[PDB]
Every structure is written in structure tokens, then in C-alpha cells.
DNA sequence: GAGGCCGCCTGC
DNA sequence: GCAGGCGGCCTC
């Protein structure tokens, strides 16, 4: 009801005296005091914030800064969130005092001196430990900022945070050069965090400016011709236009230009550095001279050309800044130099437009002069084959003794490629209770790890439960597979390591409604963990495949949370959404290209095109490459020391049946079993394929062309599935046209990969007939090797994979692409310097 | 055995 | 509307 100032105002401003106390209602209230407000905009019951400041205002009005809290509920957590908690957020407005509605308790918990140990009345009282990002989801260490003499009045750590970051990313002048008649010219700039100047080199989108030589529009393909539905009386199924794995729709990579001159104009006096122009010599691409993609396939993916072709564009247009260096200019090797950081470009010639030749570049192209990290010890649960801790050791973040594998071959394996680390094949349940149990050893007697030997803690649980293909997923076998999880984080919680990842499918996100997420999101947060989640697409980091997977990343107290890796590559936009929607809120990560990337995307030519041809059922484990790498892909997998052998280039041995079908799927880019003929075909021996049958309407389909039904089986009518129905070794197979309209057509089943695309998701069993169905050769009649499966993961040619040939192909699918692994890696390392 | 057969699927 | 996709289960 009444207000009155409690004592005597500090730091007296213009227009404002601040207090540090008042009087509400005979409550004494004080600056970091805590308080409740009614909100009118609500759907949500409550508010609670510190006041931050207290001043009266020259309007007369009694003001105080509120510092909002979030309720667990408003975060991803949701209602699994405890009720007592709260996070800090960048939420904070001037408000009347009139609307506090009461003084509320609040608790700050901080990680105990001992954290790294641990894990083995009052109507009510919060807490907080964490600071909320809502927008990427991130729960993070509490700001270490203090208030100071002129702070302590105001201070706002929300407040802060914003200043901060709206200086850091608005466009700032940093020196000047010269004025003539209102345009001046700049010898440097800076926006988001990055310096930009004269001679730096530049990320523009490719639609910034285009080049001298143009692309050619000419005529699109006509139609070919009617199809024959007699022969090819399934192709009607085909009316989408889709073609999975299509690179057609791909952007193009940054365009990169080089800084020759940079100037903006003038407002009220000053310069004006919200409009700031920079004028580039453009560099090509080899795929953007006459050369074009075909003349390109075997160029560095880091390779530019000069040009003196230049172009003005808006520096609010700059995508970053990138190393372009003059190979000869180089005090090391090509390779030394792209392989010693990011964003790394060289040029060898120049590309005049005009001549269309490759020239010495002219001297102005020419550059002036024209701390040992320890590795984290680290355990990897569900290890597989290795491919995430190959991923981390390129990374050289990890060091990985102690890998848990259950399943021999592939523990085995990852012993084949890991010398140092002690591979346990037990049920990880039963490691964990010997090591709990006070257990030295095994019965083995390999050493277990102990709390503070695992600085690192990493895992692939099994997917299958959650993977989107299980149908099902709600029985016994799917759910034992899905408490592993909680195993996992039983893991986290006794050995408490600096840095925890935790992968899976994307639908790991969606599953049971996002429970599953929003429980071990919550289970980390109790445990006092900085953590979030995220959708990487590997494709994005140099595999020609579409893979995308889930990634939980858990940070120790006093560490910082690393944030996931920015693309590299360009990718089909559709195979990108990475989005996820948990309780009608959408998450993304802190990813900021959205469409375009340094390299240009890494292609199924890319991958095999140096594999030498092989029939179904090749058996040779070990036969010479007869070849030289024929990519920048291929020269990075197999190495640059002589190795003349080409291991696991076998493939699975398809039946007679199985082998004709192969070989009458059509190579162009989106065949399969939809083009195949509807014909006989004589098999192994005295064994005959005979053409498929149609004695059904299909309601749905109707009548073809040549007046055929469409149906192979009484459902077609919508009458019950009749036994006998069902035809056996036919070319067309019977199930496909039989369950085809709930399926979108078995779209991909006998499919094709096309040279200029991408691999559909690479899975533990190559099978035509199979969900993901287009593991066919681009060319050869015969599915995919288990070293091309290899080469879609980007494992290097020298990882060993140990057993027969679906053991092998099962620990390649099972894996995470090391050059995810590497990229995440990378990340990791950012957070252990500083 | 590994291949024929497959969800009142999910998700934007 | 239609495209995704470390699949499981039952047996030629
Ligand atoms: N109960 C259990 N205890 C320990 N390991 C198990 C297990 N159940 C399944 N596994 C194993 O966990 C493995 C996960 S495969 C993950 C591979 C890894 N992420 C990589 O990059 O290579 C499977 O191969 C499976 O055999
Ligand atoms: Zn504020
Ligand atoms: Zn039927």
C-alpha cells in the first residue's frame, strides 16, 4: 500500500536518486532482495526476480530493475524440472513498485568444494545454480562478474550481458585513413568480435556478386517419352519427382573475396558505421571458371584462383574472415599449412576471364613481402569399432584408455585400433557395480578406472530402440536398450568428468513426447553439470552422407560448456532441419550458418571413385588400389606414405534373385524398384523368375494406362489380406507393390546412389529391401562395400574392422563419422584453453 | 540363417 | 502432403 525510501539515496543521477532500501506495507525490502510479480500477459501463474536497483524517479513515480528468474517449468525441462529450482536468465525491465506482489526466498547452490567426490516449515525456498539460455537451450556457470564502486547502485548482470554482446556485434570503425567530399576510407573494421583489414580475406553469401564467366540456363529436360506400364508396371509410382540423396538442391559455398579498399559516409558528423562498404578482388573457385564442376573433381577443396575482377558488397554482408595465402609465398608445405587451422585457402594461378588461361599472379596477390595441450583421459562407453574416439584423437583432446564394448568383433576392433586403452567386454551395469564394490580389477584382471582417472567420459548408446525404423520399439528387447541411457549417466554421476558427450539418433530428441531428453537433461542439471543438446548433420562436416544425430554435451562446474561446431561444408537443405520442438517451444543450437559454408559438399564421386570395380559377392579382403587417390576425399583418407593395398573393398554375396533385380535397376540418379520390368528371368540352375501378377483392383490407384489393375492382393480392395495372395520370386517384388501406398512407394528400396550426390544414412546391414533401401553401386550391380560404407563414415582407409563381413559392416554403421567426432573434438579443445 | 515383410510410425 | 532412416521379427 505505501512506499517510502528507507534511508538516504545513493548516487544521486539527473534524473533518478537510487535507494538501496524501501518500505512496503511495514517490509523492508533491500537491493538483491528477492521478489514476486502478477504478470497480465500470463499463461504462466507467477513471476520472481532480484531487484537490482531501487531509485525514485523526477516523474515522481518509485521504480526498482527487476532481474527475472525462470521456473524450471519455462525451460526445456519442463515439468520433470523440480519445482523448487530456478535459472538465472537475460530477462530484466524497470517496473513500479506498486506491483510486487511479496518478498520471496532465494537460495544460491553453488558446486561443492568436494563436487568432484560426490554422487554415491518454509512455504517454500528456492534455489538456483545455473544461468538459462532459452533460445539454444544451455544451462551454464553463473556469471563471475562483481559490482564496484559505481556499479553497486544499478548493477544488472542481465543488463550486462546484453551491453556486451550488442557492442560486440554492431559494426565498428576501427582506424581511418582519409576524408575526400564525405566517403571515407578505413584501414580497419571489426564486427563480431573479429578484426577485418586491408589484405584480410572475406566470407561473402554467393549471391554477394557473380563472376566474369557466366553459367549457361539451356533447355531442361523434356520428357523422354511415354512409359510402357505393361513392362514397367510399377514406374507409375514414381509421379513424386523426389530423388533422395539429390544434390541439386545444394547451395553454393561462401564466395571469397580479398580486401582492397573499404569506405562508408558520413551521418550527423560522424562516421557512419551501420553502412560500411568494402571493395574485394573476387577469387574463383575452380568450379566457377570454364572449368566448371567437371573440370574440378580432383582440386583441393581449400584451392582458389586470382582475379583481378572486383566487386563492392556491405560489410554487414561478411559471413567471417578466412586465411587466403599465395603458395609460394609459404614459409611450409601446401598440406602443412591447410592442415595447421580453419578457414585456410592458398592459390597457386590466377583466372583471367577474358583469355579463359591460368596466369602467374601479379605481385599485388602477394602478401607484404611482395604451448603442448595435454589430452583428457577418457572413457568411451558402447565404444563400437572406435569411430568418436577416432574422431577425438584426431582432435588430439583425447586420450582414450578404457573403452566398455559389449559385442566381441567390434571390441575386438576398436582393441585393433586403440594399443593403449584396456577394452572391457562386460555389461557396463556390472563394470560399474565392481568399481562401486571397491574392485581393483577384473577377473581378468585389467585395471578399472577409479574417480579422477576419468577426465573425459564418452558414448553412443544403442539406437536402436529409439531409431525412427523400429516399429517395434514398444517391447521388451527396445526398452531393455533404452535403459542403457541411465546407465550411462550412472556412469556420469559416480566418475563426475570434466566433460561428458552423450550421442544418439535425432529422435532421441522426439521420443516418448522428448521424455527421454528431458529426463537426462534434468539428471545432468541435478548433478550440478553445465549441459545442453543439439542436431548435428555430418554431412555439414565432410562425409558425403545424410546422418543426423543427436548430441548431448555436459560440462564439470568450473569448466567451460563447449558449443557445437560450426558447418564446414554445404549440404541439401532438406537433409539440414536440426531443429527440435520439445513441449511447443523449438531449440536450436548455437550453429550460425544456415546456408551456405567454406567447402563445397563432399560427393559420392568423392568417396569411391578410386575403389576398383568388383561383382556381388567379392570375397578379396586385401587387393590392390590399381590407382592413384583421385579426390582431395580419397588423398585425405588414404594418406600420402606408399600404401599399394586396399582392404574390406568386399561386398555381400546376393542371391541369384536378389542379383538380377541389381542388375535391371536403370544407373540414372533416383532408380529402383520402381523401374524395374515386369518380366521373367531365368535364375541359378533350372530356377525361374516369373513376371508378378495383378488380379486385384486398387481402389486407390486405379487403372493403368494400358487398362491393367494395379493390386497384388485383396487389401488393394480394402478387403482382409488373403494368404495365397502372396507370389513368390518375382523380379518386381510382391511386398513393395503389396504395402506400397502406407509406404510412400518403398521409395529408395533397390536404389541407386547417383556420382554428384550423397549416401543415404549409413546403417549397420546394407539390404535392397530394407527401410533404407538405396544401397546400391552408382554403376556396378551389387550393393556398397564395406569399405565405401567405410568411406560414407569417413574412416580413414587404415582403420581396422575385425570379423566377417556383416560384422564389419555393422560396426561402420554403428558409428559416429570421425569427422563429426573431430569437429565436436575441436570444440572441446576451444573450451580447455582459457 | 539372412532376407521377405513391414507402423492406426514419426516429423516438419 | 509426403519424406525420413546406427530397424526388428519371422521364416523360403
Ligand atoms: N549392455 C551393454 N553394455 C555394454 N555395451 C553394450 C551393451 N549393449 C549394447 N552394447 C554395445 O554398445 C555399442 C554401441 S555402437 C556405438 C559405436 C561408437 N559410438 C563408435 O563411434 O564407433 C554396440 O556395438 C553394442 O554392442
Ligand atoms: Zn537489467
Ligand atoms: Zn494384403
Partial sequence: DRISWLGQPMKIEENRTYYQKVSIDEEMLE??????????????????ARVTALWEDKNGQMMFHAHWFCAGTDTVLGATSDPLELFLVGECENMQLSYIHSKVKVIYKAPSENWAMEGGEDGKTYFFQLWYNQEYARFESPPKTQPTEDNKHKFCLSCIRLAELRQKEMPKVLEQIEEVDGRVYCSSITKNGVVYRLGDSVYLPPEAFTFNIKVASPVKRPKKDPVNETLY???????????????????????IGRIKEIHCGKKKGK?????????????????????????????????????????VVNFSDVQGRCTVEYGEDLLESIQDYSQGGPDRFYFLEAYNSKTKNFEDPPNHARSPGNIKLPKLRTL???????????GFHQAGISETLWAIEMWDPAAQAFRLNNPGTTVFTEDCNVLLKLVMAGEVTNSLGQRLPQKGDVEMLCGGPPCQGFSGMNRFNSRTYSKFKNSLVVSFLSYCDYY???????????????????????????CLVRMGYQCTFGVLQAGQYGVAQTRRRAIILAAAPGEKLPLFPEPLHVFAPRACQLSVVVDDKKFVSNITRLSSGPFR????????????????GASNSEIPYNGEPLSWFQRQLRGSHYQPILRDHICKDMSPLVAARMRHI????????????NIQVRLGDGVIAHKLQYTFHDVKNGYSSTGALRGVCSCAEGKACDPESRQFSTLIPWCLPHTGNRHNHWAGLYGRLEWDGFFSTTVTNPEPMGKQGRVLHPEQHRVVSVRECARSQGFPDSYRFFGNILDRHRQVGNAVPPPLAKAIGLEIKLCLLS
Avoid at 514414381?238 to 544434390?247: A, V
Avoid at 568494402?278 to 580432383?298: I, V
Avoid at 559438399?601 to 556381388?616: A, F
Fill in 380 to 390: 568411451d562407453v558402447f565404444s563400437g569399432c572406435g569411430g568418436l574416439s577416432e
Fill in 666 to 677: 536403370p544407373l540414372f540418379p533416383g532408380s529402383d524398384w520402381r523401374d524395374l520390368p
Fill in 233 to 255: 508396371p510399377e514406374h507409375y509410382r514414381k509421379y513424386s519427382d523426389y530423388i533422395k540423396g539429390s544434390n541439386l538442391d545444394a547451395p553454393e559455398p561462401y564466395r
Fill in 601 to 616: 559438399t563432399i560427393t559420392v564421386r568423392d568417396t569411391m571413385s578410386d575403389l576398383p570395380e568388383i561383382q556381388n
Fill in 496 to 522: 563426475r568428468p570434466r566433460f561428458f558427450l552423450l550421442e544418439n539418433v535425432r529422435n532421441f530428441v522426439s521420443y516418448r513426447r522428448s521424455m527421454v531428453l528431458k529426463l537426462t537433461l534434468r
Fill in 31 to 48: 537491493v538483491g532482495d528477492c521478489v514476486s510479480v502478477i504478470p497480465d500477459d500470463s499463461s504462466k501463474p507467477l513471476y520472481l
Fill in 271 to 311: 562516421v557512419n558505421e551501420a553502412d560500411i562498404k568494402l571493395r574485394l578482388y573476387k577469387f574463383y573457385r575452380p568450379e566457377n571458371t570454364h572449368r566448371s564442376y567437371n573440370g574440378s573433381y580432383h582440386t583441393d577443396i581449400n584451392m582458389l584462383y586470382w582475379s583481378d575482377e572486383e566487386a
